Amino acid sequence: ASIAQARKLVEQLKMEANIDRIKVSKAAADLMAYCEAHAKEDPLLTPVPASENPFR
Amino acid sequence: QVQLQESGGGLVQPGGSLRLSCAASGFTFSNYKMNWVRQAPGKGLEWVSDISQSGASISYTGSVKGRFTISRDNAKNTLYLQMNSLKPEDTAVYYCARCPAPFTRDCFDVTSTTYAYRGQGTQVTV
Amino acid sequence: ELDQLRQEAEQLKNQIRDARKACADATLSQITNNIDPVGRIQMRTRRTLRGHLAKIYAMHWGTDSRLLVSASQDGKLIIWDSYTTNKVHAIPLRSSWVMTCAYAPSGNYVACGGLDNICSIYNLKTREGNVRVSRELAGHTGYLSCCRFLDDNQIVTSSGDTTCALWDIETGQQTTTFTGHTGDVMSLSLAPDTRLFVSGACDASAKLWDVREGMCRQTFTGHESDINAICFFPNGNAFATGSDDATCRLFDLRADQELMTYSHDNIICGITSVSFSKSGRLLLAGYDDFNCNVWDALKADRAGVLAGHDNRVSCLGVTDDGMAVATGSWDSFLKIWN
Amino acid sequence: NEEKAQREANKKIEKQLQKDKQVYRATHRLLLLGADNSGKSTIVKQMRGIFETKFQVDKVNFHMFDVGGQRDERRKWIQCFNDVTAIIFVVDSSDYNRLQEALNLFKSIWNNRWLRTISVILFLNKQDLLAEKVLASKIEDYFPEFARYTTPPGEDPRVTRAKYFIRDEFLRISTASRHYCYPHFTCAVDTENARRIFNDCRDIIQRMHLRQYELL
Amino acid sequence: HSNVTEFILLGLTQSPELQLFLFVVFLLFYVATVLGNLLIVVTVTSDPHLHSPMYFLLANLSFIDICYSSVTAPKMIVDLLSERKTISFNGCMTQIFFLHFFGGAEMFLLVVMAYDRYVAICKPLHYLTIMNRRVCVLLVAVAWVGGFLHSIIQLAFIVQLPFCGPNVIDSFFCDLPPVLKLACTDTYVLGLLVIANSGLISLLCFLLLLISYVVILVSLRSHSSEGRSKALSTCTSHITVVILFFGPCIFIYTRPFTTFPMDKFVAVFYTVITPLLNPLIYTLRNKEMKAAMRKLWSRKVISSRK
């Protein structure tokens, strides 16, 4: 009954364990770089004037 | 991850005593109303008892009142069920369910067949 | 024997934890401590959308960033025009209990579901002119919690039967089925490249699935309770999940672990919906305390509050251009913040 | 150019929404809950995915939904039913093994943060099965408090004691922690259940309006 | 019959010290009444939740209150700072018409509001059919037409009376009971008309208000013994306001042919005091209204910023 569920969970964990994982430093640097690059194109981060605001 | 390891269950004669201890890891213990449930052979999940966040409010199923004592140690991050004067009908796999969310006082789905926040359980037989 | 499989499974879990710890050489907070704080983001309700009779659970912006379809539990999918606040369409649903909705990338179709366990796909570009049920996708055993269009033809939907399903709308059957979730799958989000997608479920686990294969590529743990919300980072390499443990959590796929947790002592209430801004620096999260919080995605400082709702904020989404944020709630009113 | 046509379409849609609003407010929504053994199926079939039933009593429309198509887990989809005027809660008062499950479910519904404002109309079915069981399984073995319980039926008073003990347990859960409980002793074959729901919803909406108009 | 082109009003006192003290009191009352009533109308009109049948009726009662207070209070304050205390013949008839029309409209709107209390408490499943959208707009418009005819019927004879007597009116404002003393010809039929039009109709409206509370307090008789102590306390505040409007009306208009010094002392309670009580007693106690006001008050601080 539960043997099939256990085998499926074990297989999922086995395929999950053997993956290429980067350091958390690299991931954090990538996200920070993306945010810094795209901050100039973020209307919510930088409020826009009412001239080009479509939600006046 | 929310993980719950029960221990203590084994063979014990009728009328004896038995301590079940669940070690809880992966969540803040103090914020969750902790439940003990059981599944007898060939039967569905049966709620045994629950204990609130601080331990003030404690309740048991009527079939075990005056026999079972549920307690929690938030400092040590563990739950206890002291099972006194065991009957033949108390044999079951005992799981330690958990309140699905904090800081709610409603223990939904603890006796569900595939509840996620539940230890895999310990067999108790007499 | 089940015991040996148990031992192997916990050994694999310990191995995964050890690998994540080894790769946890730093933290997002320490690296992003040197960038400037975003400051206080005051967002005003530029437009409030009303006619919904009952509480709103679903909302999805169109790709044109103007039209948005929202689902209320009175059996009504209203497609609005937030620029002019005009109700473009008001589709009456067969089942009053609707828990999800979607607006197709082309915008010709919308979708919905809830307790009926059926994804109703409606056509907004009918030759006759009226909106009729294009398709009824059934095979889910539980309530449909979320649904998102991959395109006009394909749609991936998460349900409470602890599985997701990729359907071909034209044929009307599950092209793929996604199973391993232990609890109800309450929310998913498509990747920007629309190749992989994450699904958050009620077993405090977020599973990154691959569409073309149909197997759980990655599993993300760290949440303490049910995950009611999930959304990719705009770059597609990370995602933020909101849960009932009153904390949001940003994970990264490549790092395959937690990056950050957004929480506060004053917040003891679950998150219902999460979205990212266009750049991903702001993580907007709707809470049960009837207000939303704009967390700093890189600093976790509560960087604003959107307290215009007097009931539970259940859905929350940002335009693809990032010009506005809609936060539907149980007030039965949407509010377009900017 | 197209703004005028959009305005006319919005006007038509708002007229349709006004009609739908009148219809929606006219009818009262009910959430029928129970377990597999609980006789909610007979109750919903009495006045006849989700099993819906419309029944009109004293020209008031009641739309009762029995959500049987889901899994045993209901901590999420139950939130769909905060707009219901009441939660009909069906319990086998004659089944003592699963009565504690009913009490736990009632407690969870009572204390759910999104069901704190929802009155529960408690239908204790199988009063005939409970009666024959009591005359013939002892409630005390599954409820020791009944050993020290006194009554607050015509054939014998022990049936009265048992049924009112079950009612008192449910009302204890109700009152121990803005919404009221309306227990009823109904058999499997009763035609008055619709009238009971009508009276309970009348009381619930009366209390809601009294709170609204500031009499409470 | 060379007509009396101006009347002279004797006012509340002849003492200049007391007169200056009276000025501050009346000015304060007028400012408070107009401002409170405008605020209530604006809040009811804007908040989306406050659009039920009961709230439209309360906003209409608030608009009638502004005007009654306006007529009497402006004339009295200007007269108090003034050594001469005249009013023209055209000012007298106009004052009579505006005061009566607004007052009749207010009585009819008060019987329509007592009817909503009854259907909402003894027909509770049928309320959203009897008091639907298309009836509330009709009943308010009928209250205003009833109030208009109630004044036109009075005015029809007053404007025809010849006058040659002294200019003096023993009051701070114009009304039929003093004016009837000054006319040359026998007024008897107009005297009977005041009793019928303004006396008996006021007594009938008072009975229809009173029975609505007595039926409700008998219908609630099955509730908790701890709960009824709230219902009997709320009801007693409402009947205490009703008597300050209706009591002076029954006392004066049933006896138009004769006058006493205490008529002036009795007259103030309906024409200045009562409109200051209606805005408190029907809205402070509602629990909804405080939240709807604190919403606007707190948000309007920040409109300088966004």
- Based on the structure given, which CATH architecture of chain A is correct? Irregular
User: Terminal Cα separation of chain B, in Å?
Assistant: 33 Å
The secondary-structure class of chain B comes to: mainly beta
Regarding CATH, which class of chain B? Mainly Beta
The largest inter-chain interface, given as chain pair and residues per side, is: A-C, 42 and 61 residues
What are the secondary-structure elements of chain B, in order, as H or E?
A: EEEEEEEEE
Beta-strand content of chain A: under 5%
Order of helices and strands of chain A: HH
How many domains make up the coordinates of chain B?
Answer: 1
Say which CATH homologous superfamily of chain A is assigned: Transducin (heterotrimeric G protein), gamma chain
Q: Would you count the extended β strands of chain A for me?
A: 0
> What's the quaternary structure here?
heteropentamer
Terminal CA distance of chain A reads: 61 Å
Helix proportion range of chain B:
under 10%
CATH class of chain A: Few Secondary Structures
CATH topology of chain B: Immunoglobulin-like
Strands side by side in the biggest sheet of chain B:
5-4-3-8-9
The number of helical runs of chain A is 2
Family (chain C): Belongs to the WD repeat G protein beta family.
WD repeats (chain C): 44-92, 93-138, 139-179, 180-221, 222-265, 266-307, 308-338
GO biological process, one term (chain C): retina development in camera-type eye
Pfam families (chain C): WD40_Gbeta (PF25391)
Description:
The complex is a heteropentamer of chains A (56), B (126), C (338), D (216) and E (306). Chain A has two helices and no strands. Chain A has one domain: G Protein Gi Gamma 2 (Irregular). The longest helix of chain A has 16 residues. In chain B, strand 3 and strand 4 form a beta hairpin. Chain B is globular. The N and C termini of chain B lie far apart (33 Å). Helices cover 45% and strands 18% of the residues of chain D. In chain D, strands 2-3-1-4-5-6 form a six-stranded mixed β-sheet, sandwiched between helices. In chain D, helix 3 runs parallel beside helix 6 and helix 4 crosses helix 6. Classes of the chains: A mainly alpha (56), B mainly beta (126), C mainly beta (338), D alpha/beta (216), E mainly alpha (306). Chains in contact: A-C, B-C, B-D, C-D, C-E, D-E. At the D-E interface, helix 1 and helix 7 of D face helix 4 and helix 8 of E. Chain A: This is Guanine nucleotide-binding protein G(I)/G(S)/G(O) subunit gamma-2. Chain A: Belongs to the G protein gamma family. Chain A: Its main location: membrane. Chain A: Keywords: Acetylation, Cell membrane, Host-virus interaction, Lipoprotein, Membrane, Methylation, Prenylation, Transducer.
